[PDB]
Amino acid sequence: KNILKIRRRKMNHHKYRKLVKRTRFLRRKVREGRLRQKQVKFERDLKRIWQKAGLKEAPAGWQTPKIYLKNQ
Amino acid sequence: KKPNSANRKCCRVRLSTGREAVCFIPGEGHSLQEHHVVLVQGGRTQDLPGVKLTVVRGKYDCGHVQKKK
Amino acid sequence: DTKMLWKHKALQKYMENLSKEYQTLEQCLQHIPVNEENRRSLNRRHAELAPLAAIYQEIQETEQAIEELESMCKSLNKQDEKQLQELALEERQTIDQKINMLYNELFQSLVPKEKYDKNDVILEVTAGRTTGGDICQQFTREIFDMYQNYSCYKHWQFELLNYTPADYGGLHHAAARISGDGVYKHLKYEGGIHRVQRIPEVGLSSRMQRIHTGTMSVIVLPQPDEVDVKLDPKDLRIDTFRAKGAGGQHVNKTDSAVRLVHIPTGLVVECQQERSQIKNKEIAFRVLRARLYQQIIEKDKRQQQSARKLQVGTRAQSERIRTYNFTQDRVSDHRIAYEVRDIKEFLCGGKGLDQLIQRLLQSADEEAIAELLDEHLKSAK
RNA sequence: AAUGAGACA
RNA sequence: AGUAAGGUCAGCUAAAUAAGCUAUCGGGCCCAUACCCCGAAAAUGUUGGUUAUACCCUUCCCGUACUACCA
RNA sequence: CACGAUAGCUAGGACCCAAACUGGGAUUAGAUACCCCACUAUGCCUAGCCCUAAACCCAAAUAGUUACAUAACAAAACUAUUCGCCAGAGUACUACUCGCAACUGCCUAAAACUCAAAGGACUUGGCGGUGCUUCACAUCCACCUAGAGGAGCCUGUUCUAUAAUCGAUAAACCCCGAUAGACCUUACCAACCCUUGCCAAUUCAGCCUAUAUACCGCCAUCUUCAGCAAACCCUAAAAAGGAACAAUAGUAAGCACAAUCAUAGCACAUAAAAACGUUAGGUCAAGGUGUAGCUUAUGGGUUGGAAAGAAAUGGGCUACAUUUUCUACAUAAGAAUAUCCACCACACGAAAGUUUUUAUGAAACUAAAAACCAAAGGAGGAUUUAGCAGUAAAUCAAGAA
Ligand SMILES: [K+]
Ligand SMILES: [K+]
Ligand SMILES: [K+]
Ligand SMILES: [K+]
Ligand SMILES: [Mg+2]
Ligand SMILES: [Mg+2]
Ligand SMILES: [Mg+2]
Ligand SMILES: [Mg+2]
Ligand SMILES: [Mg+2]
Ligand SMILES: [Mg+2]
Ligand SMILES: [Mg+2]
Ligand SMILES: [Mg+2]
Ligand SMILES: [Mg+2]
Ligand SMILES: [Mg+2]
Ligand SMILES: [Mg+2]
Ligand SMILES: [Mg+2]
Ligand SMILES: [Mg+2]
Ligand SMILES: [Mg+2]
Ligand SMILES: [Mg+2]
Ligand SMILES: [Mg+2]
Ligand SMILES: [Mg+2]
Ligand SMILES: [Mg+2]
Ligand SMILES: [Mg+2]
Ligand SMILES: [Mg+2]
Ligand SMILES: [Mg+2]
Ligand SMILES: [Mg+2]
Ligand SMILES: [Mg+2]
Ligand SMILES: [Mg+2]
Ligand SMILES: [Mg+2]
Ligand SMILES: [Mg+2]
Ligand SMILES: [Mg+2]
Ligand SMILES: [Mg+2]
Ligand SMILES: [Mg+2]
Ligand SMILES: [Mg+2]
Ligand SMILES: [Mg+2]
Ligand SMILES: [Mg+2]
Ligand SMILES: [Mg+2]
Ligand SMILES: [Mg+2]
Ligand SMILES: [Mg+2]
Ligand SMILES: [Mg+2]
Ligand SMILES: [Mg+2]
Ligand SMILES: [Mg+2]
Ligand SMILES: [Mg+2]
Ligand SMILES: [Mg+2]
Ligand SMILES: [Mg+2]
Ligand SMILES: [Mg+2]
Ligand SMILES: [Mg+2]
Ligand SMILES: [Mg+2]
Ligand SMILES: [Mg+2]
Ligand SMILES: [Mg+2]
Ligand SMILES: [Mg+2]
Ligand SMILES: [Mg+2]
Ligand SMILES: [Mg+2]
Ligand SMILES: [Mg+2]
Ligand SMILES: [Mg+2]
Ligand SMILES: [Mg+2]
Ligand SMILES: [Mg+2]
Numbered sequence A: 001k002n003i004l005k006i007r008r009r010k011m012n013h014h015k016y017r018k019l020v021k022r023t024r025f026l027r028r029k030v031r032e033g034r035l036r037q038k039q040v041k042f043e044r045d046l047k048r049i050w051q052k053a054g055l056k057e058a059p060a061g062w063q064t065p066k067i068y069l070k071n072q
Numbered sequence B: 001k002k003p004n005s006a007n008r009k010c011c012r013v014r015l016s017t018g019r020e021a022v023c024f025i026p027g028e029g030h031s032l033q034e035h036h037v038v039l040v041q042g043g044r045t046q047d048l049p050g051v052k053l054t055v056v057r058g059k060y061d062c063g064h065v066q067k068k069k
Numbered sequence C: 001d002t003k004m005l006w007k008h009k010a011l012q013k014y015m016e017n018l019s020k021e022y023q024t025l026e027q028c029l030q031h032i033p034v035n036e037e038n039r040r041s042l043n044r045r046h047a048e049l050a051p052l053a054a055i056y057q058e059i060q061e062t063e064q065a066i067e068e069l070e071s072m073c074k075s076l077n078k079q080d081e082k083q084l085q086e087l088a089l090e091e092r093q094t095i096d097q098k099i100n101m102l103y104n105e106l107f108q109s110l111v112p113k114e115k116y117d118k119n120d121v122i123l124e125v126t127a128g129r130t131t132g133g134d135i136c137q138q139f140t141r142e143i144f145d146m147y148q149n150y151s152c153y154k155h156w157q158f159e160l161l162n163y164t165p166a167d168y169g170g171l172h173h174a175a176a177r178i179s180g181d182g183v184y185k186h187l188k189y190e191g192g193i194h195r196v197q198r199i200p201e202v203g204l205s206s207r208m209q210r211i212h213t214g215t216m217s218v219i220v221l222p223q224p225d226e227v228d229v230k231l232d233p234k235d236l237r238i239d240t241f242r243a244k245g246a247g248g249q250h251v252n253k254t255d256s257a258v259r260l261v262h263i264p265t266g267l268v269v270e271c272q273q274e275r276s277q278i279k280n281k282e283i284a285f286r287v288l289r290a291r292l293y294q295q296i297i298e299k300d301k302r303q304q305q306s307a308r309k310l311q312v313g314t315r316a317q318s319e320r321i322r323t324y325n326f327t328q329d330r331v332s333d334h335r336i337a338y339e340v341r342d343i344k345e346f347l348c349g350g351k352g353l354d355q356l357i358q359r360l361l362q363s364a365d366e367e368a369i370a371e372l373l374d375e376h377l378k379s380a381k
Numbered sequence D: 001a002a003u004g005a006g007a008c009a
Numbered sequence E: 001a002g003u004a005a006g007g008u009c010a011g012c013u014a015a016a017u018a019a020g021c022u023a024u025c026g027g028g029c030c031c032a033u034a035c036c037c038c039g040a041a042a043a044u045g046u047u048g049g050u051u052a053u054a055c056c057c058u059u060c061c062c063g064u065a066c067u068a069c070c071a
Numbered sequence F: 001c002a003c004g005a006u007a008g009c010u011a012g013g014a015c016c017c018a019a020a021c022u023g024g025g026a027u028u029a030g031a032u033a034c035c036c037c038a039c040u041a042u043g044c045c046u047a048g049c050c051c052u053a054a055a056c057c058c059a060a061a062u063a064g065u066u067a068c069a070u071a072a073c074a075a076a077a078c079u080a081u082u083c084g085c086c087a088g089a090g091u092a093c094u095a096c097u098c099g100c101a102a103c104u105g106c107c108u109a110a111a112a113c114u115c116a117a118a119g120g121a122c123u124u125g126g127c128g129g130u131g132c133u134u135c136a137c138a139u140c141c142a143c144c145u146a147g148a149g150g151a152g153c154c155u156g157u158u159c160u161a162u163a164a165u166c167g168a169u170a171a172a173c174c175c176c177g178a179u180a181g182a183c184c185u186u187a188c189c190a191a192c193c194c195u196u197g198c199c200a201a202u203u204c205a206g207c208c209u210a211u212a213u214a215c216c217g218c219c220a221u222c223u224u225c226a227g228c229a230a231a232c233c234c235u236a237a238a239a240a241g242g243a244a245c246a247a248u249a250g251u252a253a254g255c256a257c258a259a260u261c262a263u264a265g266c267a268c269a270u271a272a273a274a275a276c277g278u279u280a281g282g283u284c285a286a287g288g289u290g291u292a293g294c295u296u297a298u299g300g301g302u303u304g305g306a307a308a309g310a311a312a313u314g315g316g317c318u319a320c321a322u323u324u325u326c327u328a329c330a331u332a333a334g335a336a337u338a339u340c341c342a343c344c345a346c347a348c349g350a351a352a353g354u355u356u357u358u359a360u361g362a363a364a365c366u367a368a369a370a371a372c373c374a375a376a377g378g379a380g381g382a383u384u385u386a387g388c389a390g391u392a393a394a395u396c397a398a399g400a401a
Helices: A003-022 A024-052 C002-006 C009-031 C036-074 C078-110 C135-153 C277-311 C351-380
Strands: B010-014 B020-024 C121-126 C157-165 C171-179 C192-198 C212-222 C236-239 C258-262 C268-271 C322-325 C330-333 C338-340
Touching (some): A003 A024, C002 C009, C009 C351, C036 C078, C078 C351, C121 C135, C135 C157, C135 C171, C135 C212, C135 C351, C268 C277, C330 C351
Parallel strands (some): C192 C322
Antiparallel strands (some): B010 B020, C121 C212, C157 C171, C192 C212, C236 C258, C258 C268, C322 C330, C330 C338
16 A cells, blocks of 8 residues: 555654754754855855946945844 | 675776776686776676676786686 | 605705705805804704705605616516516515605605694684574584584683573574684684585474575684783883972972883873872883783784684675585585585584594695795795 | 564475 | 772672572473563672671772872 | 645733643553653734645546546546646655745755666455354363372483484474394494305495485374365456355366265264375385495494483373271171380381392393382472263273284
8 A cells, every 4th residue: 555655754754853853953053154155155246246347345335234144 | 685695706996087996807717916907898797786897808917718727 | 645745846846946055055164264154144054954955865866766667667577577576566665665754754844834823712603694593593503512522522621701592592602712732723724604504403493394504603713822011121211300280389399290201112101190209200100001001902902803804704605614514414615625424423523523624734734835835936036 | 462484486 | 108998699789587689590381482470599808806606807809989288 | 916724933811621741650571652640831812923734525727528438446438728747666755056034944856876676456365462143062261070290110302421323303202113122133333354245147236325305105284174176158358256046157077075884783972084285294214216425345244332310301100098008808897097105116108229039041131929128208389181971080801022
């Protein structure tokens, strides 16, 4: 019967939900690490825009927000 | 792997592209030593997982199988 | 026999080299004013080859006398026929009597290099993992009792160390120490995998009487000798340097530290714990002895692990040194291609296993001697 | 009242 | 160094009325093993002294533990 | 764009009762589970978030047809317009990436590598601590009688032992091959002899040498179970199945059961029978034989010798008495009776052991009788065997070799 496939998917999900719990703080470090590079790479993309347009400095009053930051 | 059990004479060589791969020696008996030059084909051995190359007998430092004498 | 062994060209050629070398030793000493340091070395080498050179010369004289037998049989007269059959048929047998003494002594005096043979050996048997059931576990018990009875036949001493029975009347694993004079000599080629092919009779596998193949692994490890640390002032350099801490005037004006340096090894042990140098010196000596003793044990572990992880291998039927086929009543060793019948007596130790070991050792000597004779040519070329 | 099968098509 | 402090069945505990559980040995139950039921065996680290012994003290031995500070 | 059970988060309020987690009790080898008791998050109201389900009627929306036509199963088959989705299985409701009031999260979603399969439905068989109905006449429970396990002895295995057989070894081995070993038997061991070495012949005799996993023979067993096999027919296909008596696809023969026969009337009962198969069940050692091995030796003959029981166990005989013991004797008798004691001496129970003698035999080590001797045993732990009437039990006798 099809139960031979639901059980196989049950064990994999049950083992994955223990791999996250055992190494929860390892994922916390990596997630924040990827978020910093995500923000930094976004800054370089905006920095490329104004440099190629001929300007020397970013337009006055423009401070790039940290979109990938925890807020509410 | 079962149900086929034996001792297959293999070797590990580094190819001309720089990669290092596992190869197999067909036939019975060989005199291959370390730092010898051989030629490898693209055949595969069904019994051995992972092995996907075979040395072609009769080229460079490996000769043909020697008849019993 | 020994005559066939001598007829090999490698053995005759090597003895020629000894004959040439032994004569060459005399020529250099008698003629050349050799220096005293070099002269003694040749003198010692001259004495060593003195029995070997004489043995080969007697072989040549004996071989030449055989050539006389061929010539006599050629020139045959009716009256001389009786004389030759009464002399040549006796001289040839007499010649065959003498060559046995020369050839046997050559291998009894050469004595290929041997080591250990006087250290207690631990014999470990396990349960191979190749087939389900107790066919392999039950078979482990039989061979374990085979060696135990074999030790009594060889007048050895058997010391049980570990014994773990299995659920279905078997041996999961076991280990014992065997002490004697020739333990490691005889029990050197018994290490490997012993395959068994039989129809189950007693045990869990007896529920279905179909021929099954199982395996078990035997580990033979020579246990090392004792340890006794020997130290003397020649091996220790003591640097009475100062120490760092908080003692006011006392620390600034006291060398309350010891740096022990083991000259033979190079180890540096420094103790600066207490206030007095006497306390520091006492502890430093104790630590150096303890650390040196630990190094010896770790050396023993590496040697044993590098040996017990070789005989075990991957625990597969592909590797095996002996196959026990109860179905056809044969016990065959793959190395020597020697097959023995009557497994019932073979598994009870005694002469059944002793006879097999004798050919294993003779084959070992044959391989080493044959290679050495070629290696003599390699050194000569 | 927990466990067991190896070289049978 | 000094001081403290302990050794008991194979193992771990409580008592000195040397016991309890487990392990070990024998048997039963089951197709066989384990569980389970039944029966038996088993020790006071060491020497000396403690009416006489043991729980005590002493000697030997192993191992455990704290402290080694002001200049 | 808007919404989305339940669980979960943030803030405030409510709390009868239920209740993850946690604590106690019990069960179990262990029970951080099922069962019992207590109580928290929470289930509830207001405001915000999360956006996941077997979110399954596993069947998409709108118009229709009952024509064509049964893979299987299920909820019968199909046409028109349109959108979404699907390219072997495992890796994978995963890694990396984009968005998200999410931060142990959701959505999107690969590859390296491994295998030649994964998967849907069905058929027969086996099994089920699945349910319903019916039934065990030695039988599972309830229940009857006599015994085994406790002791001695006899005998058979395992282990121990020796230079000194082999085979059986869950039910279906264990007074088994043996209705039978002092030599012989005998196949075992230690020595010492013989090499056309039984016969008409043979570059051949001989082998208790290996293989019951090559076999014929002769059986064990499910089994006092009723089913097996061949011919033929049927099925909108057939792996297979084949009955309804007021009958709906089956038919007549073969083997087995049945009937009959034996135990000198019938009856009943007991014997005898019990197919096809299952366990590669037991037997190369009744004998024969395939294949493999030996051939001045694994063959043949002579002489002597296979002891011994630390210990464990199975099946038996004799007991542990008063329904008994002893004597006479067939069954209506006399006497004894573990206790008393001022001393004594005593019951039941040696089958064992010592000594003597007889029987067989060339040889007694084997058997039997007597005298002496009087030990364990005071109704036997867990557990377990047999029997439904001339049966259990008690007692007597003969025969096979
Ligand atoms: K069925
Ligand atoms: K009995
Ligand atoms: K005889
Ligand atoms: K035969
Ligand atoms: Mg998985
Ligand atoms: Mg190929
Ligand atoms: Mg293939
Ligand atoms: Mg070429
Ligand atoms: Mg060329
Ligand atoms: Mg298994
Ligand atoms: Mg287990
Ligand atoms: Mg919701
Ligand atoms: Mg909710
Ligand atoms: Mg809620
Ligand atoms: Mg949160
Ligand atoms: Mg709240
Ligand atoms: Mg509440
Ligand atoms: Mg409540
Ligand atoms: Mg609890
Ligand atoms: Mg719903
Ligand atoms: Mg769906
Ligand atoms: Mg839908
Ligand atoms: Mg739609
Ligand atoms: Mg609509
Ligand atoms: Mg519609
Ligand atoms: Mg159909
Ligand atoms: Mg397709
Ligand atoms: Mg794929
Ligand atoms: Mg999910
Ligand atoms: Mg995910
Ligand atoms: Mg009964
Ligand atoms: Mg009786
Ligand atoms: Mg008894
Ligand atoms: Mg007995
Ligand atoms: Mg026997
Ligand atoms: Mg047997
Ligand atoms: Mg014979
Ligand atoms: Mg058979
Ligand atoms: Mg009939
Ligand atoms: Mg009749
Ligand atoms: Mg009748
Ligand atoms: Mg009958
Ligand atoms: Mg009948
Ligand atoms: Mg068989
Ligand atoms: Mg059987
Ligand atoms: Mg048999
Ligand atoms: Mg025969
Ligand atoms: Mg036999
Ligand atoms: Mg034959
Ligand atoms: Mg003979
Ligand atoms: Mg008994
Ligand atoms: Mg009987
Ligand atoms: Mg009587
Ligand atoms: Mg009377
Ligand atoms: Mg009496
Ligand atoms: Mg009497
Ligand atoms: Mg008597």
